[PDB]
Motif scaffolding. Structure first.
Motif, mmCIF file in Angstrom:
data_model
loop_
_atom_site.group_PDB
_atom_site.id
_atom_site.type_symbol
_atom_site.label_atom_id
_atom_site.label_comp_id
_atom_site.label_asym_id
_atom_site.label_seq_id
_atom_site.Cartn_x
_atom_site.Cartn_y
_atom_site.Cartn_z
ATOM 1 N N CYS A 1 24.426 -1.163 -17.154
ATOM 2 C CA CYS A 1 25.665 -0.085 -17.388
ATOM 3 C C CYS A 1 25.216 0.902 -18.194
ATOM 4 O O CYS A 1 25.409 2.103 -18.049
ATOM 5 C CB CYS A 1 26.705 -0.972 -18.055
ATOM 6 S SG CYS A 1 28.306 -0.094 -18.228
ATOM 7 N N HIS A 2 24.228 0.715 -19.223
ATOM 8 C CA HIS A 2 23.724 1.839 -19.923
ATOM 9 C C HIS A 2 22.773 2.752 -19.074
ATOM 10 O O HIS A 2 22.576 3.971 -19.816
ATOM 11 C CB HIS A 2 23.248 1.423 -21.232
ATOM 12 C CG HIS A 2 23.931 0.781 -22.087
ATOM 13 N ND1 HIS A 2 24.174 -1.008 -21.861
ATOM 14 C CD2 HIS A 2 24.375 0.836 -23.171
ATOM 15 C CE1 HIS A 2 24.997 -1.050 -22.778
ATOM 16 N NE2 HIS A 2 25.395 -0.374 -23.785
ATOM 17 N N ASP A 3 22.102 2.522 -18.197
ATOM 18 C CA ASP A 3 21.480 3.238 -17.274
ATOM 19 C C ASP A 3 22.196 4.362 -16.605
ATOM 20 O O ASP A 3 21.776 5.640 -16.729
ATOM 21 C CB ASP A 3 20.578 2.200 -16.173
ATOM 22 C CG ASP A 3 19.615 1.565 -16.803
ATOM 23 O OD1 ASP A 3 20.170 0.324 -17.401
ATOM 24 O OD2 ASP A 3 18.433 1.745 -16.765
ATOM 25 N N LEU A 4 23.385 4.097 -16.120
ATOM 26 C CA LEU A 4 24.258 5.291 -15.568
ATOM 27 C C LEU A 4 24.855 6.012 -16.654
ATOM 28 O O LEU A 4 25.248 7.379 -16.502
ATOM 29 C CB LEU A 4 25.348 4.573 -14.811
ATOM 30 C CG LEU A 4 25.190 4.676 -13.333
ATOM 31 C CD1 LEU A 4 24.940 6.068 -12.707
ATOM 32 C CD2 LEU A 4 23.846 3.867 -12.903
ATOM 33 N N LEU A 5 24.696 5.495 -17.908
ATOM 34 C CA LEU A 5 25.398 6.258 -19.041
ATOM 35 C C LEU A 5 24.445 7.163 -19.582
ATOM 36 O O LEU A 5 24.879 8.379 -20.455
ATOM 37 C CB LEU A 5 25.892 5.362 -20.136
ATOM 38 C CG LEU A 5 26.826 5.944 -20.990
ATOM 39 C CD1 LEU A 5 28.064 6.395 -20.605
ATOM 40 C CD2 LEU A 5 27.463 4.975 -22.348
ATOM 41 N N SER A 6 23.275 7.100 -19.371
ATOM 42 C CA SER A 6 22.134 7.983 -19.669
ATOM 43 C C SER A 6 22.349 9.618 -18.918
ATOM 44 O O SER A 6 21.806 10.524 -19.918
ATOM 45 C CB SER A 6 20.680 7.629 -19.474
ATOM 46 O OG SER A 6 19.760 8.457 -19.691
#
Ligand SMILES: *[C@@H]1O[C@H](CO)[C@@H](O[C@@H]2O[C@H](CO)[C@@H](O)[C@H](O)[C@H]2NC(C)=O)[C@H](O)[C@H]1NC(C)=O
Ligand SMILES: *[C@@H]1O[C@H](CO)[C@@H](O)[C@H](O)[C@H]1NC(C)=O
Lengths: 49, 48
Positions: B34-39
């Protein structure tokens, strides 16, 4: 600062033992081949595969 | 000719609870993917 989460220390795995098999291979490999006009349906439940 | 003393009450609000919100704990609780798309939305997580 950013947040954090407590890391797990174990793993719980629960399944129903002594359960029969679904034997799906015998259903697909049958001599009697159906027709697209009168196709049937078989439901597999409470078994392992 | 005859008087007395009366009493009234009044309430005036001067404060409010201070809430704090963040991107991580609200959107991506514990999922790493989920944090990858938030980058890509890196800047739109500090102005909030
Ligand atoms: C292939 O399909 C036939 C159905 O045409 C199966 O025959 C049935 O078998 C069950 C027992 O599993 C009987 O209760 C039915 O009466 C049978 N139907 C008949 C004879 O028309 C057959 O078991 C399937 N598998 C194989 C390996 O042939
Ligand atoms: C005013 O009212 C009070 C209330 O009972 C009374 O005790 C008092 O005697 C009054 N005074 C006059 C001047 O009327």
């Amino acid at each position: 600062l950013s947040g954090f989460t407590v890391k797990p220390v174990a793993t719980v795995y629960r399944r129903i033992p002594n359960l029969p098999d679904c034997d799906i291979d015998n259903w697909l490999n049958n001599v009697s081949v159906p027709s697209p006009l009168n196709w049937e349906r078989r439901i597999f439940s409470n078994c392992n595969f | 000719t005859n008087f007395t003393i009366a009493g009234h009450e009044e309430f005036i609000q001067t404060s409010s609870p201070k809430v704090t919100i963040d991107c991580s704990a609200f959107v991506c609780s514990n999922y790493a993917a989920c944090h990858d798309l938030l980058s890509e939305y890196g800047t739109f997580c500090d102005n909030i």
